[PDB]
A paper describes a structure:
To visualize the lipid–channel complex, we added LPA to nanodisc-reconstituted TRPV1 and determined a consensus cryo-EM map to a resolution of 3.0 Å. Through symmetry expansion and focused classification, we captured LPA bound within the vanilloid pocket in multiple stoichiometries, ranging from apo to all four subunits occupied. We thus refer to these structures as ‘empty’ to differentiate from the ‘apo’ structures, in which an endogenous lipid occupies the pocket. With resting and fully liganded structures representing closed and open configurations of the pore (S6) helices, respectively, we examined intermediate conformational states associated with substochiometric LPA binding (the four subunits are denoted as A through D in a counterclockwise orientation as viewed from the extracellular face).
The capsaicin- and heat-activated receptor, TRPV1, has served as a model for deciphering lipid modulation, which is relevant to understanding how pro-algesic agents enhance channel activity in the setting of inflammatory pain. Identification of a pocket within the TRPV1 transmembrane core has provided initial clues as to how phosphoinositide lipids bind to and regulate the channel. Here we show that this regulatory pocket in rat TRPV1 can accommodate diverse lipid species, including the inflammatory lipid lysophosphatidic acid, whose actions are determined by their specific modes of binding. We captured several states of TRPV1 ranging from channels in which the VBP is empty to those bearing different bioactive lipids, including distinct phosphoinositide species, brominated phosphoinositide analogs and a pro-algesic lipid, lysophosphatidic acid (LPA). Together, our data show how the VBP accommodates a range of bioactive lipids and how occupancy of the site corresponds to the structural status of the pore.
Residue numbers in the entry:
A (entry chain A): 199 to 603, 627 to 752
B (entry chain D): 545 to 603, 627 to 703
C (entry chain D): 199 to 272
């Protein structure tokens, strides 16, 4: 602690008398407590509040004290103040929130109150475009920090206040009876060229507490669906068709590969050989394209080397397919037969990567997300336990076997594994002694793995399905959002065409004599109750 | 003949229990079997093409034969040694094990779980559909 | 929109005074608003109500206004 000044303590003590007694005789009101106890970090858990007396009073939910601003026997309390990290009062408010119920409620209410008072005192000032050292607006900070409650609040802000209502973000145009149309501001959501809520949320790291649930906010979901239906649906379908055609050509080329030995192979002047070679060339070109695309993704996003292998499985899979193809070419030109092995690996990986495009169809996308989650949790746990069991009993069995074909670890392990797929034998060899021990071991292994663990796997998966519906849907929505953002940034057919939404003059007049246009977005609504 | 015999289910309406059971079967074939068949067929075709490519020459050097042999796994009849005409046995066994793990162990079990969820979810709707069928 | 007559607007505004002031001096009560905004279709989402002042008052849940029927100066 470094700035526990008298007024600081008084505010922390929450008394209306000591604060006033300090206010008289002009107590200083621009002291910054940069004490290590007053900074942000786990060590010596303190309480970060913004570092300014106004910010402290705000974090403490002291509305009564607040409105002391702009009075006499006093010193400036500029709403545009800045701490050692540049955070304002609004930044402090967004920071303190922890997405709880009361906390949300209070924090939003204050945030409002400060907004209205600031507008009243300095209508010519624009708070929310202030930025910190990171250059993030309070809305941007909330979007990048996981605070869903404030995001919902700001993005649906309404202030029906006659003289400075212009700060509101949601508007009502016309109500011709029970059905009325509203407008949502799009400024600093879809296109900013420095920081946009959509781009930030989509590319937010995996550590964000509520990355999935963020897109469920009204405006964001409507905007994403609109962009989809406008142009991304058709662009994505075209890309899917191109990938399918490339895969078909690759499969056809691989299928008819010649069998003579020691490549490369001479090109006979024939139509069939010509088709084979051109298909080869096309497949290698596609591999190069995917390789470069993966490199571009790695360099542009710059993953932090932790999320790299934890998020973006699809990018890794496509890059690995490209690597296999390129290594196959390298070997093919090096006079080695292993190019066949590399080619088949790449072919299988590419074919199984067709699931990627299942996004863009809600049902199949959610199904693919289910498959991911399953492979991540249940298959992993079962595989670990089952492999331990299998190795143990396989070693025991091979030890028991005296000598013969199955006197090797590989053969016995394969034979024991054959049980798991409903193909066990129980008599695959007799070269041993003590048949009772052999049969006991096999029966124990069968009971432990086949009867118990597989059935347990079915039950655990069932529970998983029962548990991850909504999360799967949200993950699918996030995947589609990322696809839309990439496509738009790709310049594939946009070139700043394929516009975003409509423009309107909604206020009529701002506090200044000038009017304004706020790049709004329309969503009609109908309600019977609440006339 | 087969189509006619299997069309005997139509008359299961008029008996509440069996009618609701038939409606369950419809819904299942419509949703779960469809999704699983799509994903599984993609997987099967991919790995079958890879395997046939790997195989050098012999009886199983055709797409149809290899596809059938890979499918035999799904019904508890896989072989894992149905041919040796190739090189690089490690690649072959790796491909077969990956295919087994991905389809047999994972996807079938997932199918069972999804159906269970479906059953848990569509009781009342199934009864209402049966009532509508009887009304028609 | 094609039939946003004075009484139409008054009913849509849900006021008991303007409606009566139009009722006196015999305001017409058989006007049909066949405006494209007053028809049924997704394009330009409006509000279909029946196209008649009585129907409009009904769709708006204006029971108080209703029972004005079968009266004088009407
Ligand atoms: C590493 C290996 C792990 C392979 C299995 C698990 C991953 C997987 O696969 O599922 C996801 C994948 C692509 O999801 P995503 O990129 O979108 O992942 C994330 C994820 O969802 C999360 O929610 C968010 O980060 C974000 O929403 C989203 O971005 O989906 C496929 O590509 C199906 C591919 C399924 C094939 C898996 C096995 C492939 C091996 C083939 C072997 C070939 C023979 C040798």
């Amino acid at each position: 602690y470094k700035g526990q000044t008298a007024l600081h303590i008084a505010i922390e003590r929450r008394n209306m008398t000591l604060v006033t007694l300090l206010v008289e005789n002009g107590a200083d009101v621009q002291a910054a407590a940069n004490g290590d106890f007053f900074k942000k970090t786990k060590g010596r858990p303190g309480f970060y509040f913004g570092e300014l007396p106004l910010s402290l009073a705000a974090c403490t939910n002291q509305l009564a004290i607040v409105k002391f601003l702009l009075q006499n026997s006093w010193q400036p309390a500029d709403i545009s103040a800045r701490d050692s990290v540049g955070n304002t009062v609004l930044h402090a408010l967004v920071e303190v929130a922890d997405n709880t119920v009361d906390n949300t409620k209070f924090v939003t209410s204050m945030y409002n109150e400060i907004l209205i008072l600031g507008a009243k005192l300095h209508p010519t000032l624009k708070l929310e475009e202030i930025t910190n050292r990171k250059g993030l607006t309070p809305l941007a900070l909330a979007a990048s920090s996981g605070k869903i409650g404030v995001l919902a609040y700001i993005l649906q802000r309404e202030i029906h206040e006659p003289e400075c209502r212009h700060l509101s973000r949601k508007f009502t145009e016309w109500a011709y009876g029970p059905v009325h149309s509203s407008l949502y501001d799009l400024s600093c959501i879809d296109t900013c060229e420095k920081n946009s809520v959509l781009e930030v949320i989509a590319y937010s790291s995996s550590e964000t507490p509520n990355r999935h649930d963020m897109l469920l906010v009204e405006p964001l979901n409507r905007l994403l669906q609109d962009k989809w239906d406008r142009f991304v649906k058709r662009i994505f379908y075209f890309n899917f068709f191109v990938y399918c055609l490339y895969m078909i050509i690759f499969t056809a080329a691989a299928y008819y590969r010649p069998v003579e030995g020691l490549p490369p192979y001479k090109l006979k002047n024939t139509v069939g050989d010509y088709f084979r070679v051109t298909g080869e060339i096309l497949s290698v070109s596609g591999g190069v394209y995917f390789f470069f695309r993966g490199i571009q993704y790695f360099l542009q996003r710059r993953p932090s080397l932790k999320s790299l292998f934890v998020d973006s499985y699809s990018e890794i899979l496509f890059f690995v397919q490209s690597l296999f193809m390129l290594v196959s070419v390298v070997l093919y030109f090096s006079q080695r037969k292993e190019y066949v092995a590399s080619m088949v690996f790449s072919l299988a990986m590419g074919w199984t990567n067709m699931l990627y495009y299942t996004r863009g169809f809600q049902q199949m996308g959610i199904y693919a997300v289910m498959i991911e989650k399953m492979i991540l949790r249940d298959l992993c746990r079962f595989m670990f336990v089952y492999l331990v069991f299998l190795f143990g009993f396989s070693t025991a069995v091979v030890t028991l076997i005296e000598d013969g074909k199955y006197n090797s670890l590989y053969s016995t392990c394969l034979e024991l594994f054959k049980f798991t797929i409903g193909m066990g034998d129980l008599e695959f060899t007799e070269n041993y002694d003590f048949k009772a021990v052999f049969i006991i071991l096999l029966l124990a292994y069968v009971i432990l793995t086949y009867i118990l663990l597989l059935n347990m796997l079915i039950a655990l998966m069932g529970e998983t399905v029962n548990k991850i519906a909504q999360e799967s849907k949200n993950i699918w929505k996030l995947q589609r959002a990322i696809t839309i953002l990439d496509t738009e940034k790709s310049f594939l057919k946009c070139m700043r065409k394929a516009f975003r939404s409509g423009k309107l003059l909604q206020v009529g007049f701002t506090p200044d004599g000038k009017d304004d246009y706020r790049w709004c977005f329309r969503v009609d609504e109908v309600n019977w109750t609440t006339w």
